[model samples]
Target: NAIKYLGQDYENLRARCLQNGVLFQDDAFPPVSHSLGFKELGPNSSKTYGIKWKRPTELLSNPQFIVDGATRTDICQGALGDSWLLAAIASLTLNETILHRVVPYGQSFQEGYAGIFHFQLWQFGEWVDVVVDDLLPTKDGKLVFVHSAQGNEFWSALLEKAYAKVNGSYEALSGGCTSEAFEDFTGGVTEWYDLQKAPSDLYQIILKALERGSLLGCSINISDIRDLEAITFKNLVRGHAYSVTDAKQVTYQGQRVNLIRMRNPWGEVEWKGPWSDNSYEWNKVDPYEREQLRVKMEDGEFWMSFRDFIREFTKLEICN
Candidate 1:
Protein backbone atom coordinates (compact mmCIF):
# COMPACT_ATOMS: atom_id res chain seq x y z
CA ASN A 1 0.00 0.00 0.00
CA ALA A 2 1.21 3.55 -0.71
CA ILE A 3 2.15 5.64 2.29
CA LYS A 4 -0.50 8.27 2.98
CA TYR A 5 1.19 11.67 3.10
CA LEU A 6 -1.66 14.00 4.15
CA GLY A 7 -3.46 11.61 6.46
CA GLN A 8 -0.28 10.17 8.04
CA ASP A 9 0.89 13.45 9.53
CA TYR A 10 -1.96 13.68 11.98
CA GLU A 11 0.45 14.01 14.91
CA ASN A 12 2.01 17.26 13.61
CA LEU A 13 -1.19 19.22 13.06
CA ARG A 14 -2.91 18.29 16.24
CA ALA A 15 -3.97 21.89 16.83
CA ARG A 16 -5.82 21.86 13.52
CA CYS A 17 -8.13 19.21 14.90
CA LEU A 18 -9.63 22.00 17.06
CA GLN A 19 -11.64 19.68 19.21
CA ASN A 20 -11.14 17.29 22.11
CA GLY A 21 -12.09 13.65 21.50
CA VAL A 22 -12.73 14.40 17.85
CA LEU A 23 -10.50 13.03 15.08
CA PHE A 24 -11.13 14.92 11.82
CA GLN A 25 -10.65 13.01 8.61
CA ASP A 26 -10.04 15.02 5.48
CA ASP A 27 -11.65 13.97 2.19
CA ALA A 28 -13.57 11.14 3.77
CA PHE A 29 -16.63 11.76 1.64
CA PRO A 30 -18.65 8.65 2.24
CA PRO A 31 -20.93 7.35 -0.54
CA VAL A 32 -18.33 8.04 -3.20
CA SER A 33 -15.93 5.63 -4.88
CA HIS A 34 -12.72 7.07 -6.39
CA SER A 35 -13.03 10.55 -4.83
CA LEU A 36 -11.68 9.33 -1.54
CA GLY A 37 -11.15 5.70 -2.45
CA PHE A 38 -7.45 5.41 -3.30
CA LYS A 39 -6.22 8.11 -5.68
CA GLU A 40 -7.41 11.37 -4.06
CA LEU A 41 -4.55 13.55 -5.31
CA GLY A 42 -4.98 17.24 -4.38
CA PRO A 43 -5.44 20.03 -1.78
CA ASN A 44 -7.92 21.11 0.85
CA SER A 45 -9.35 24.58 1.45
CA SER A 46 -7.39 24.93 4.69
CA LYS A 47 -4.04 25.07 2.86
CA THR A 48 -3.27 21.58 4.16
CA TYR A 49 -2.51 18.52 2.05
CA GLY A 50 -5.33 16.03 1.54
CA ILE A 51 -5.04 12.25 1.33
CA LYS A 52 -4.78 10.61 -2.04
CA TRP A 53 -5.86 7.15 -3.18
CA LYS A 54 -6.14 4.13 -0.87
CA ARG A 55 -7.19 0.58 -1.59
CA PRO A 56 -10.44 -0.58 0.02
CA THR A 57 -8.44 -3.24 1.82
CA GLU A 58 -6.17 -0.64 3.38
CA LEU A 59 -9.10 1.43 4.65
CA LEU A 60 -10.66 -1.67 6.12
CA SER A 61 -7.55 -3.12 7.79
CA ASN A 62 -5.42 -0.08 8.54
CA PRO A 63 -5.75 1.36 12.03
CA GLN A 64 -6.20 4.90 10.65
CA PHE A 65 -7.55 7.31 13.22
CA ILE A 66 -11.30 7.16 13.32
CA VAL A 67 -13.90 9.47 14.85
CA ASP A 68 -17.18 8.06 16.13
CA GLY A 69 -16.19 4.86 14.28
CA ALA A 70 -15.89 6.47 10.84
CA THR A 71 -12.54 6.86 9.04
CA ARG A 72 -10.99 10.31 9.52
CA THR A 73 -8.26 11.84 7.38
CA ASP A 74 -7.54 15.30 6.03
CA ILE A 75 -9.06 16.00 2.59
CA CYS A 76 -8.96 19.49 1.23
CA GLN A 77 -11.51 20.94 -1.13
CA GLY A 78 -10.21 19.56 -4.44
CA ALA A 79 -10.27 20.03 -8.24
CA LEU A 80 -11.71 23.07 -10.11
CA GLY A 81 -15.32 22.25 -9.33
CA ASP A 82 -17.48 21.26 -6.36
CA SER A 83 -18.17 24.50 -4.56
CA TRP A 84 -20.34 22.53 -2.20
CA LEU A 85 -17.41 20.36 -1.15
CA LEU A 86 -15.18 23.36 -0.51
CA ALA A 87 -17.81 24.88 1.71
CA ALA A 88 -18.16 21.58 3.49
CA ILE A 89 -14.43 21.45 4.25
CA ALA A 90 -14.40 24.98 5.63
CA SER A 91 -17.45 24.28 7.76
CA LEU A 92 -15.92 21.16 9.23
CA THR A 93 -12.54 22.79 9.75
CA LEU A 94 -14.11 25.48 11.89
CA ASN A 95 -16.34 23.25 13.98
CA GLU A 96 -15.20 19.70 14.74
CA THR A 97 -18.75 19.05 15.84
CA ILE A 98 -19.79 19.33 12.20
CA LEU A 99 -17.90 16.12 11.36
CA HIS A 100 -20.36 14.06 13.30
CA ARG A 101 -23.29 14.88 11.05
CA VAL A 102 -21.60 13.28 8.04
CA VAL A 103 -20.54 10.08 9.78
CA PRO A 104 -23.85 9.01 11.25
CA TYR A 105 -22.92 5.32 11.15
CA GLY A 106 -19.93 5.77 13.50
CA GLN A 107 -18.18 3.24 11.28
CA SER A 108 -16.50 4.13 7.98
CA PHE A 109 -17.22 0.71 6.45
CA GLN A 110 -20.86 0.77 7.46
CA GLU A 111 -21.38 4.07 5.64
CA GLY A 112 -21.03 2.46 2.19
CA TYR A 113 -20.72 6.02 0.85
CA ALA A 114 -23.93 6.02 -1.13
CA GLY A 115 -26.32 8.11 0.93
CA ILE A 116 -27.00 11.61 2.19
CA PHE A 117 -24.07 13.71 3.49
CA HIS A 118 -26.00 15.43 6.22
CA PHE A 119 -24.95 19.06 6.60
CA GLN A 120 -26.38 22.47 7.30
CA LEU A 121 -26.13 23.99 3.84
CA TRP A 122 -26.93 27.55 4.91
CA GLN A 123 -28.50 28.32 1.56
CA PHE A 124 -31.02 25.58 2.17
CA GLY A 125 -31.53 26.85 5.74
CA GLU A 126 -32.50 23.68 7.56
CA TRP A 127 -29.97 20.98 8.42
CA VAL A 128 -30.47 18.00 6.20
CA ASP A 129 -28.51 14.97 5.21
CA VAL A 130 -28.09 15.72 1.53
CA VAL A 131 -28.13 12.43 -0.31
CA VAL A 132 -24.66 12.14 -1.79
CA ASP A 133 -24.37 10.80 -5.31
CA ASP A 134 -21.36 8.97 -6.69
CA LEU A 135 -21.63 10.54 -10.13
CA LEU A 136 -18.71 12.82 -11.09
CA PRO A 137 -18.69 15.36 -13.88
CA THR A 138 -16.38 14.48 -16.77
CA LYS A 139 -15.07 17.06 -19.26
CA ASP A 140 -18.15 16.28 -21.29
CA GLY A 141 -20.33 17.20 -18.31
CA LYS A 142 -21.47 13.66 -17.74
CA LEU A 143 -21.36 12.49 -14.15
CA VAL A 144 -18.91 9.58 -13.97
CA PHE A 145 -17.20 9.96 -10.57
CA VAL A 146 -18.00 11.98 -7.48
CA HIS A 147 -16.05 15.30 -7.39
CA SER A 148 -15.29 18.07 -4.86
CA ALA A 149 -12.66 20.74 -5.38
CA GLN A 150 -11.75 24.21 -4.16
CA GLY A 151 -12.47 25.90 -7.47
CA ASN A 152 -16.20 26.32 -7.34
CA GLU A 153 -18.10 29.27 -5.82
CA PHE A 154 -20.16 26.84 -3.84
CA TRP A 155 -16.88 25.98 -2.12
CA SER A 156 -16.11 29.62 -1.43
CA ALA A 157 -19.61 30.11 -0.14
CA LEU A 158 -19.20 27.28 2.30
CA LEU A 159 -15.97 28.77 3.58
CA GLU A 160 -17.64 32.13 3.84
CA LYS A 161 -20.51 30.57 5.69
CA ALA A 162 -18.03 29.19 8.20
CA TYR A 163 -16.14 32.52 8.37
CA ALA A 164 -12.99 31.12 6.72
CA LYS A 165 -10.73 32.86 4.26
CA VAL A 166 -9.92 31.41 0.86
CA ASN A 167 -6.57 31.93 -0.85
CA GLY A 168 -4.47 30.77 -3.84
CA SER A 169 -5.04 30.74 -7.57
CA TYR A 170 -5.72 27.48 -9.41
CA GLU A 171 -2.88 27.76 -11.96
CA ALA A 172 -0.35 28.77 -9.31
CA LEU A 173 -0.81 25.27 -7.89
CA SER A 174 -0.33 23.44 -11.22
CA GLY A 175 2.23 20.67 -11.18
CA GLY A 176 1.19 17.39 -12.75
CA CYS A 177 -2.36 16.79 -13.94
CA THR A 178 -3.16 15.32 -10.55
CA SER A 179 -0.88 17.49 -8.43
CA GLU A 180 -3.43 20.29 -8.50
CA ALA A 181 -5.07 18.58 -5.55
CA PHE A 182 -2.07 19.42 -3.40
CA GLU A 183 -2.41 23.12 -4.12
CA ASP A 184 -6.08 23.16 -3.25
CA PHE A 185 -5.49 21.58 0.13
CA THR A 186 -2.43 23.58 1.15
CA GLY A 187 -2.86 26.82 -0.85
CA GLY A 188 0.75 26.36 -2.02
CA VAL A 189 3.09 23.49 -2.76
CA THR A 190 5.28 22.92 0.28
CA GLU A 191 8.35 20.72 0.53
CA TRP A 192 6.21 17.87 1.75
CA TYR A 193 3.84 18.35 -1.16
CA ASP A 194 6.70 17.97 -3.63
CA LEU A 195 8.00 14.86 -1.89
CA GLN A 196 4.57 13.26 -2.12
CA LYS A 197 3.91 14.32 -5.72
CA ALA A 198 5.62 11.36 -7.37
CA PRO A 199 3.62 8.70 -5.59
CA SER A 200 0.43 10.73 -5.56
CA ASP A 201 0.67 11.79 -9.19
CA LEU A 202 2.76 9.76 -11.67
CA TYR A 203 3.19 6.57 -9.69
CA GLN A 204 -0.53 6.20 -9.04
CA ILE A 205 -1.63 7.35 -12.48
CA ILE A 206 0.55 4.59 -13.99
CA LEU A 207 -0.42 2.05 -11.35
CA LYS A 208 -4.13 2.62 -11.83
CA ALA A 209 -3.78 2.51 -15.58
CA LEU A 210 -1.85 -0.74 -15.49
CA GLU A 211 -3.92 -2.50 -12.82
CA ARG A 212 -5.64 -4.58 -15.52
CA GLY A 213 -2.27 -5.51 -17.02
CA SER A 214 -0.57 -3.60 -19.90
CA LEU A 215 -4.02 -3.61 -21.47
CA LEU A 216 -5.12 -0.92 -18.99
CA GLY A 217 -2.30 1.55 -18.26
CA CYS A 218 -1.60 5.09 -19.45
CA SER A 219 -0.56 5.03 -23.14
CA ILE A 220 -0.50 7.05 -26.35
CA ASN A 221 -2.18 5.32 -29.32
CA ILE A 222 0.12 6.93 -31.97
CA SER A 223 -2.95 8.40 -33.66
CA ASP A 224 -3.53 11.37 -31.31
CA ILE A 225 -1.43 13.92 -33.19
CA ARG A 226 -4.13 15.83 -35.01
CA ASP A 227 -4.91 18.08 -32.04
CA LEU A 228 -1.79 20.20 -32.46
CA GLU A 229 -1.89 23.09 -34.86
CA ALA A 230 1.37 24.47 -33.41
CA ILE A 231 3.54 23.64 -30.41
CA THR A 232 5.04 26.35 -28.21
CA PHE A 233 4.71 26.77 -24.47
CA LYS A 234 3.15 30.08 -23.31
CA ASN A 235 2.25 30.58 -26.98
CA LEU A 236 1.54 27.00 -27.91
CA VAL A 237 -1.46 26.51 -30.23
CA ARG A 238 -2.02 22.84 -29.47
CA GLY A 239 -5.56 21.77 -30.22
CA HIS A 240 -8.16 21.59 -27.51
CA ALA A 241 -7.78 17.88 -26.63
CA TYR A 242 -5.97 14.57 -27.30
CA SER A 243 -4.46 11.56 -25.51
CA VAL A 244 -1.16 9.65 -25.26
CA THR A 245 -1.68 6.23 -26.81
CA ASP A 246 1.90 5.33 -27.84
CA ALA A 247 5.46 6.77 -28.14
CA LYS A 248 8.97 5.65 -29.27
CA GLN A 249 12.36 7.10 -28.27
CA VAL A 250 15.54 5.56 -26.80
CA THR A 251 16.44 6.72 -23.32
CA TYR A 252 19.83 8.27 -22.52
CA GLN A 253 20.85 4.92 -21.05
CA GLY A 254 20.35 3.41 -24.56
CA GLN A 255 17.24 1.55 -23.49
CA ARG A 256 15.00 0.79 -26.49
CA VAL A 257 11.57 1.48 -24.92
CA ASN A 258 10.80 4.32 -27.37
CA LEU A 259 7.45 3.90 -29.09
CA ILE A 260 4.70 5.95 -27.44
CA ARG A 261 1.08 6.88 -28.20
CA MET A 262 -1.57 9.50 -27.31
CA ARG A 263 -5.27 10.06 -27.94
CA ASN A 264 -7.37 13.13 -28.74
CA PRO A 265 -10.43 13.28 -26.52
CA TRP A 266 -12.36 14.11 -29.66
CA GLY A 267 -11.37 10.57 -30.68
CA GLU A 268 -10.75 11.65 -34.27
CA VAL A 269 -7.45 13.53 -34.31
CA GLU A 270 -3.91 12.18 -34.98
CA TRP A 271 -0.49 13.28 -36.21
CA LYS A 272 0.45 12.25 -39.75
CA GLY A 273 3.95 10.72 -39.68
CA PRO A 274 5.90 7.58 -40.69
CA TRP A 275 4.03 5.99 -37.80
CA SER A 276 1.17 8.41 -38.30
CA ASP A 277 0.02 9.60 -41.76
CA ASN A 278 -2.20 6.54 -41.80
CA SER A 279 0.73 4.12 -41.63
CA TYR A 280 0.36 0.32 -41.72
CA GLU A 281 -0.24 0.25 -37.95
CA TRP A 282 -3.26 2.52 -38.34
CA ASN A 283 -6.63 0.78 -38.46
CA LYS A 284 -4.86 -2.63 -38.40
CA VAL A 285 -5.74 -3.04 -34.72
CA ASP A 286 -9.29 -3.49 -33.54
CA PRO A 287 -11.30 -0.37 -34.27
CA TYR A 288 -13.08 -0.86 -30.99
CA GLU A 289 -9.73 -0.92 -29.22
CA ARG A 290 -8.73 2.11 -31.25
CA GLU A 291 -11.99 3.73 -30.30
CA GLN A 292 -11.55 2.80 -26.68
CA LEU A 293 -8.06 4.25 -26.71
CA ARG A 294 -9.26 7.45 -28.37
CA VAL A 295 -8.55 10.73 -26.64
CA LYS A 296 -11.28 12.84 -25.09
CA MET A 297 -10.26 16.42 -25.67
CA GLU A 298 -11.30 19.38 -23.55
CA ASP A 299 -9.26 22.54 -22.83
CA GLY A 300 -6.02 20.59 -22.20
CA GLU A 301 -6.18 17.10 -23.71
CA PHE A 302 -3.70 17.24 -26.60
CA TRP A 303 -0.48 15.32 -27.14
CA MET A 304 2.61 16.68 -25.42
CA SER A 305 6.07 15.95 -26.84
CA PHE A 306 8.13 13.80 -24.50
CA ARG A 307 10.66 16.60 -24.11
CA ASP A 308 7.81 18.88 -23.16
CA PHE A 309 6.23 16.30 -20.89
CA ILE A 310 9.51 15.70 -19.05
CA ARG A 311 10.52 19.33 -19.02
CA GLU A 312 7.15 20.56 -17.80
CA PHE A 313 5.96 17.67 -15.61
CA THR A 314 9.28 16.28 -14.33
CA LYS A 315 10.35 19.66 -12.95
CA LEU A 316 6.96 20.44 -11.45
CA GLU A 317 7.80 19.40 -7.87
CA ILE A 318 11.62 19.60 -8.18
CA CYS A 319 13.74 22.73 -8.13
CA ASN A 320 16.88 21.77 -10.02
Candidate 2:
Protein backbone atom coordinates (compact mmCIF):
# COMPACT_ATOMS: atom_id res chain seq x y z
CA ASN A 1 0.00 0.00 0.00
CA ALA A 2 1.25 3.49 -0.79
CA ILE A 3 1.80 6.01 2.03
CA LYS A 4 -0.80 8.51 0.90
CA TYR A 5 -3.09 10.36 3.33
CA LEU A 6 -6.87 10.18 2.85
CA GLY A 7 -6.18 7.70 0.07
CA GLN A 8 -5.24 10.56 -2.23
CA ASP A 9 -2.36 10.85 -4.70
CA TYR A 10 -0.50 14.20 -4.64
CA GLU A 11 1.55 14.21 -7.85
CA ASN A 12 -1.22 12.78 -10.01
CA LEU A 13 -3.71 15.39 -8.76
CA ARG A 14 -1.25 18.25 -9.17
CA ALA A 15 -0.50 17.15 -12.72
CA ARG A 16 -4.22 16.98 -13.46
CA CYS A 17 -4.69 20.52 -12.17
CA LEU A 18 -1.73 21.87 -14.18
CA GLN A 19 -2.87 20.23 -17.38
CA ASN A 20 -6.47 21.46 -16.94
CA GLY A 21 -5.20 25.05 -16.20
CA VAL A 22 -7.15 25.17 -12.93
CA LEU A 23 -6.26 25.40 -9.26
CA PHE A 24 -6.25 22.22 -7.19
CA GLN A 25 -9.23 22.13 -4.84
CA ASP A 26 -8.71 19.37 -2.33
CA ASP A 27 -12.07 17.67 -1.84
CA ALA A 28 -10.56 15.43 0.84
CA PHE A 29 -9.85 18.45 3.03
CA PRO A 30 -12.32 21.07 1.98
CA PRO A 31 -11.89 24.77 2.77
CA VAL A 32 -14.99 25.26 4.89
CA SER A 33 -16.27 25.61 8.45
CA HIS A 34 -15.92 21.85 8.86
CA SER A 35 -12.15 22.19 8.59
CA LEU A 36 -12.09 24.81 11.38
CA GLY A 37 -13.74 22.25 13.72
CA PHE A 38 -15.06 24.66 16.35
CA LYS A 39 -14.80 28.18 17.62
CA GLU A 40 -14.75 29.51 21.15
CA LEU A 41 -17.87 31.26 22.42
CA GLY A 42 -16.45 34.20 24.35
CA PRO A 43 -15.45 37.82 23.94
CA ASN A 44 -13.28 36.58 21.06
CA SER A 45 -15.91 35.18 18.73
CA SER A 46 -15.60 34.42 15.02
CA LYS A 47 -18.66 36.61 14.52
CA THR A 48 -16.39 39.67 14.60
CA TYR A 49 -13.37 37.64 13.57
CA GLY A 50 -14.78 37.35 10.04
CA ILE A 51 -12.87 34.14 9.43
CA LYS A 52 -12.46 33.48 5.71
CA TRP A 53 -10.69 30.88 3.65
CA LYS A 54 -8.27 32.72 1.38
CA ARG A 55 -5.41 31.85 -0.96
CA PRO A 56 -1.98 33.31 -0.35
CA THR A 57 -2.03 35.34 -3.54
CA GLU A 58 -5.31 36.94 -2.44
CA LEU A 59 -3.78 37.99 0.88
CA LEU A 60 -0.58 39.48 -0.53
CA SER A 61 0.61 41.13 -3.71
CA ASN A 62 3.15 38.30 -4.14
CA PRO A 63 3.70 35.10 -2.18
CA GLN A 64 6.48 32.50 -1.86
CA PHE A 65 6.51 29.07 -0.22
CA ILE A 66 10.17 29.16 0.89
CA VAL A 67 11.88 32.51 1.23
CA ASP A 68 15.73 32.63 1.14
CA GLY A 69 15.80 29.17 2.76
CA ALA A 70 13.68 28.01 5.70
CA THR A 71 14.69 28.59 9.34
CA ARG A 72 13.15 28.37 12.81
CA THR A 73 12.69 32.13 12.75
CA ASP A 74 10.12 31.75 10.00
CA ILE A 75 7.45 30.55 12.47
CA CYS A 76 5.02 32.83 14.31
CA GLN A 77 1.99 31.55 16.18
CA GLY A 78 -1.35 33.17 15.47
CA ALA A 79 -4.78 32.96 17.12
CA LEU A 80 -4.63 29.19 17.29
CA GLY A 81 -3.22 27.54 20.44
CA ASP A 82 -1.10 24.99 18.53
CA SER A 83 2.16 26.29 19.95
CA TRP A 84 3.07 22.67 20.64
CA LEU A 85 3.18 22.01 16.89
CA LEU A 86 5.16 25.22 16.37
CA ALA A 87 7.60 24.16 19.09
CA ALA A 88 8.23 20.87 17.32
CA ILE A 89 8.68 22.78 14.09
CA ALA A 90 11.21 25.04 15.81
CA SER A 91 13.32 22.01 16.70
CA LEU A 92 12.68 20.48 13.27
CA THR A 93 14.33 23.50 11.59
CA LEU A 94 17.57 22.65 13.43
CA ASN A 95 17.85 19.32 11.59
CA GLU A 96 18.39 19.75 7.84
CA THR A 97 17.83 16.12 6.89
CA ILE A 98 14.55 15.94 8.79
CA LEU A 99 13.53 19.38 7.60
CA HIS A 100 14.03 18.54 3.90
CA ARG A 101 12.33 15.20 4.43
CA VAL A 102 9.17 16.79 5.76
CA VAL A 103 9.28 19.75 3.39
CA PRO A 104 10.35 18.52 -0.04
CA TYR A 105 12.12 20.61 -2.66
CA GLY A 106 10.79 22.05 -5.97
CA GLN A 107 7.84 23.63 -4.08
CA SER A 108 7.11 27.28 -4.70
CA PHE A 109 4.47 29.84 -5.68
CA GLN A 110 5.67 30.21 -9.24
CA GLU A 111 6.78 27.83 -12.06
CA GLY A 112 3.83 25.48 -11.41
CA TYR A 113 1.23 27.31 -9.35
CA ALA A 114 -1.29 24.53 -8.99
CA GLY A 115 -2.63 25.61 -5.57
CA ILE A 116 -1.35 22.32 -4.13
CA PHE A 117 1.47 21.21 -1.81
CA HIS A 118 2.52 17.89 -0.32
CA PHE A 119 4.21 17.34 3.06
CA GLN A 120 5.48 13.99 4.28
CA LEU A 121 4.92 13.18 7.95
CA TRP A 122 6.10 10.10 9.79
CA GLN A 123 3.15 7.99 10.88
CA PHE A 124 3.59 4.69 12.70
CA GLY A 125 6.97 3.63 11.24
CA GLU A 126 5.95 4.90 7.82
CA TRP A 127 6.04 8.15 5.91
CA VAL A 128 2.65 9.53 4.79
CA ASP A 129 2.44 12.12 2.06
CA VAL A 130 -0.41 14.57 2.89
CA VAL A 131 -1.40 16.73 -0.02
CA VAL A 132 -3.16 20.03 0.82
CA ASP A 133 -4.76 22.91 -0.98
CA ASP A 134 -3.40 26.46 -0.55
CA LEU A 135 -6.62 27.95 0.88
CA LEU A 136 -5.80 28.93 4.49
CA PRO A 137 -7.80 30.32 7.39
CA THR A 138 -7.62 34.06 7.23
CA LYS A 139 -8.99 37.02 9.21
CA ASP A 140 -9.10 40.48 7.70
CA GLY A 141 -6.75 39.54 4.86
CA LYS A 142 -4.14 38.12 7.26
CA LEU A 143 -3.36 34.57 8.28
CA VAL A 144 -5.26 33.77 11.49
CA PHE A 145 -3.19 30.75 12.49
CA VAL A 146 0.52 29.94 12.51
CA HIS A 147 2.27 32.23 10.01
CA SER A 148 5.71 33.34 8.90
CA ALA A 149 7.93 36.18 10.06
CA GLN A 150 7.77 37.58 6.56
CA GLY A 151 4.19 38.26 5.56
CA ASN A 152 4.58 36.77 2.09
CA GLU A 153 6.12 33.46 3.23
CA PHE A 154 3.53 30.69 3.77
CA TRP A 155 5.51 27.51 4.61
CA SER A 156 4.68 27.54 8.31
CA ALA A 157 1.02 28.26 7.69
CA LEU A 158 0.73 25.70 4.89
CA LEU A 159 2.52 23.06 6.92
CA GLU A 160 0.19 23.71 9.85
CA LYS A 161 -2.86 23.30 7.61
CA ALA A 162 -1.66 19.90 6.37
CA TYR A 163 -1.15 18.71 9.92
CA ALA A 164 -4.52 20.13 10.88
CA LYS A 165 -6.20 18.17 8.10
CA VAL A 166 -4.53 14.98 9.29
CA ASN A 167 -5.72 15.71 12.82
CA GLY A 168 -9.36 16.17 11.65
CA SER A 169 -9.47 19.96 11.80
CA TYR A 170 -7.53 23.00 12.95
CA GLU A 171 -9.53 23.07 16.18
CA ALA A 172 -8.34 19.56 16.97
CA LEU A 173 -4.77 20.96 16.96
CA SER A 174 -5.45 23.46 19.78
CA GLY A 175 -3.58 21.27 22.29
CA GLY A 176 -0.88 18.62 21.73
CA CYS A 177 2.46 17.32 22.98
CA THR A 178 5.76 18.33 21.38
CA SER A 179 7.11 14.80 21.49
CA GLU A 180 4.02 13.56 19.67
CA ALA A 181 4.59 16.14 16.96
CA PHE A 182 8.31 15.37 16.96
CA GLU A 183 7.62 11.67 16.50
CA ASP A 184 5.25 12.40 13.60
CA PHE A 185 7.77 14.70 11.89
CA THR A 186 11.02 12.77 12.47
CA GLY A 187 10.06 9.16 13.27
CA GLY A 188 12.40 9.31 16.27
CA VAL A 189 12.17 7.71 19.69
CA THR A 190 10.60 10.21 22.08
CA GLU A 191 11.13 10.47 25.82
CA TRP A 192 9.29 12.71 28.24
CA TYR A 193 10.96 13.96 31.44
CA ASP A 194 9.00 15.18 34.42
CA LEU A 195 11.45 17.63 35.93
CA GLN A 196 9.92 17.32 39.40
CA LYS A 197 11.17 13.76 39.51
CA ALA A 198 14.12 14.30 37.23
CA PRO A 199 16.96 11.84 37.06
CA SER A 200 20.46 12.58 38.39
CA ASP A 201 21.83 12.86 34.84
CA LEU A 202 19.06 15.07 33.50
CA TYR A 203 21.41 17.84 32.44
CA GLN A 204 23.85 15.41 30.85
CA ILE A 205 20.92 13.72 29.11
CA ILE A 206 19.96 17.03 27.54
CA LEU A 207 23.60 17.64 26.60
CA LYS A 208 23.84 14.31 24.82
CA ALA A 209 20.50 14.79 23.12
CA LEU A 210 21.52 18.19 21.78
CA GLU A 211 24.91 16.95 20.60
CA ARG A 212 23.29 14.05 18.78
CA GLY A 213 20.86 16.41 16.99
CA SER A 214 17.80 15.26 18.88
CA LEU A 215 14.64 17.36 19.04
CA LEU A 216 13.57 18.70 22.44
CA GLY A 217 10.74 20.80 23.92
CA CYS A 218 9.55 21.73 27.40
CA SER A 219 6.44 23.16 29.12
CA ILE A 220 5.21 23.97 32.60
CA ASN A 221 2.02 22.57 34.05
CA ILE A 222 -0.93 24.77 34.85
CA SER A 223 -3.52 24.23 37.55
CA ASP A 224 -6.01 26.80 36.35
CA ILE A 225 -7.53 26.69 32.89
CA ARG A 226 -7.65 30.48 32.73
CA ASP A 227 -3.89 30.58 33.27
CA LEU A 228 -3.36 29.50 29.67
CA GLU A 229 -0.65 31.71 28.13
CA ALA A 230 -0.39 33.58 31.43
CA ILE A 231 3.14 34.93 31.89
CA THR A 232 4.87 34.06 35.12
CA PHE A 233 7.00 36.56 37.03
CA LYS A 234 10.02 35.14 35.14
CA ASN A 235 8.31 35.91 31.82
CA LEU A 236 7.76 32.23 30.94
CA VAL A 237 4.25 31.24 29.96
CA ARG A 238 2.60 28.96 32.47
CA GLY A 239 0.76 26.60 30.13
CA HIS A 240 2.65 27.38 26.93
CA ALA A 241 5.26 25.13 25.28
CA TYR A 242 8.84 25.95 24.27
CA SER A 243 11.47 24.39 22.02
CA VAL A 244 14.83 23.36 23.49
CA THR A 245 17.49 24.66 21.12
CA ASP A 246 20.77 24.32 23.03
CA ALA A 247 22.26 22.69 26.15
CA LYS A 248 25.70 23.21 27.69
CA GLN A 249 27.59 22.46 30.92
CA VAL A 250 30.17 25.14 31.54
CA THR A 251 32.24 26.37 34.46
CA TYR A 252 30.79 29.17 36.53
CA GLN A 253 32.52 30.38 39.70
CA GLY A 254 34.87 27.43 39.95
CA GLN A 255 32.01 24.93 39.55
CA ARG A 256 30.62 23.28 36.44
CA VAL A 257 27.04 24.32 35.92
CA ASN A 258 24.39 23.16 33.47
CA LEU A 259 22.71 25.63 31.13
CA ILE A 260 19.70 25.15 28.86
CA ARG A 261 18.57 27.36 26.01
CA MET A 262 14.89 27.35 25.03
CA ARG A 263 12.97 29.35 22.45
CA ASN A 264 9.39 30.50 22.82
CA PRO A 265 6.92 29.74 20.07
CA TRP A 266 5.68 33.33 20.10
CA GLY A 267 9.29 34.38 19.39
CA GLU A 268 9.50 37.38 21.77
CA VAL A 269 8.70 36.77 25.45
CA GLU A 270 11.97 35.47 27.01
CA TRP A 271 12.80 34.16 30.45
CA LYS A 272 13.90 36.99 32.70
CA GLY A 273 15.04 34.68 35.51
CA PRO A 274 18.63 34.13 36.61
CA TRP A 275 21.30 32.91 34.16
CA SER A 276 19.66 34.79 31.28
CA ASP A 277 21.91 36.54 28.80
CA ASN A 278 21.90 39.77 30.85
CA SER A 279 22.15 38.00 34.22
CA TYR A 280 25.12 38.48 36.58
CA GLU A 281 25.92 34.74 36.59
CA TRP A 282 27.66 35.08 33.22
CA ASN A 283 30.19 37.54 34.72
CA LYS A 284 32.09 34.67 36.34
CA VAL A 285 32.71 32.90 33.04
CA ASP A 286 35.57 33.99 30.83
CA PRO A 287 34.60 36.76 28.39
CA TYR A 288 35.54 34.54 25.41
CA GLU A 289 33.55 31.62 26.73
CA ARG A 290 30.59 33.81 27.53
CA GLU A 291 30.61 35.25 24.05
CA GLN A 292 30.88 31.79 22.55
CA LEU A 293 28.03 30.31 24.60
CA ARG A 294 25.87 33.36 25.19
CA VAL A 295 23.99 34.26 22.04
CA LYS A 296 22.51 37.57 23.15
CA MET A 297 19.29 38.34 21.32
CA GLU A 298 15.65 39.18 22.03
CA ASP A 299 14.39 36.51 19.68
CA GLY A 300 12.55 34.65 22.48
CA GLU A 301 15.72 32.80 23.62
CA PHE A 302 17.06 32.55 27.18
CA TRP A 303 19.35 30.41 29.31
CA MET A 304 18.76 28.99 32.76
CA SER A 305 20.50 26.62 35.13
CA PHE A 306 19.33 23.01 35.25
CA ARG A 307 18.06 23.52 38.77
CA ASP A 308 16.07 26.53 37.67
CA PHE A 309 14.95 24.77 34.53
CA ILE A 310 13.52 21.84 36.48
CA ARG A 311 11.97 24.10 39.06
CA GLU A 312 10.26 26.31 36.51
CA PHE A 313 9.49 24.00 33.60
CA THR A 314 7.75 20.81 34.72
CA LYS A 315 7.93 18.81 31.48
CA LEU A 316 10.65 18.00 28.92
CA GLU A 317 10.47 16.12 25.62
CA ILE A 318 13.54 14.59 23.95
CA CYS A 319 13.24 12.79 20.63
CA ASN A 320 16.29 11.05 19.26
Highest lDDT: give the candidate number: 2
- lDDT of candidate 2 at residue 181, scale 0 to 100: 94
For candidate 2, list the clashing residue pairs, or say none: none
Local distance difference test values of all predictions, in order: 0.28, 0.85
Q: Cα-based RMSD of the predictions, in order?
A: 16.6, 2.4
Best-fitting candidate, measured by TM-score? Answer: 2
Clash statistics: count for each candidate: 79, 0
In the range 4-114, model 2's lDDT, one tens digit per residue, is 987788888888999999998888889877787766612256542588889897778789998977888788888778889999998899888889999988888888889
Off by over 4 Å in 2: 41-48, 225-227
Q: How well is each residue in 1-320 modelled by candidate 1, as lDDT tens digits? A: 21222233323333344334333333433223333222232233232233233322232342222332221112232333232233223223322343443333232222232211222222222232222211122223321222222122121222221211111222222222322222233232322222223453443343333232121112111235654233343322232212222343322223332233433222233443323433444345456643543344322223333434433222222100
Model 1 clash tally, residue pairs = 79
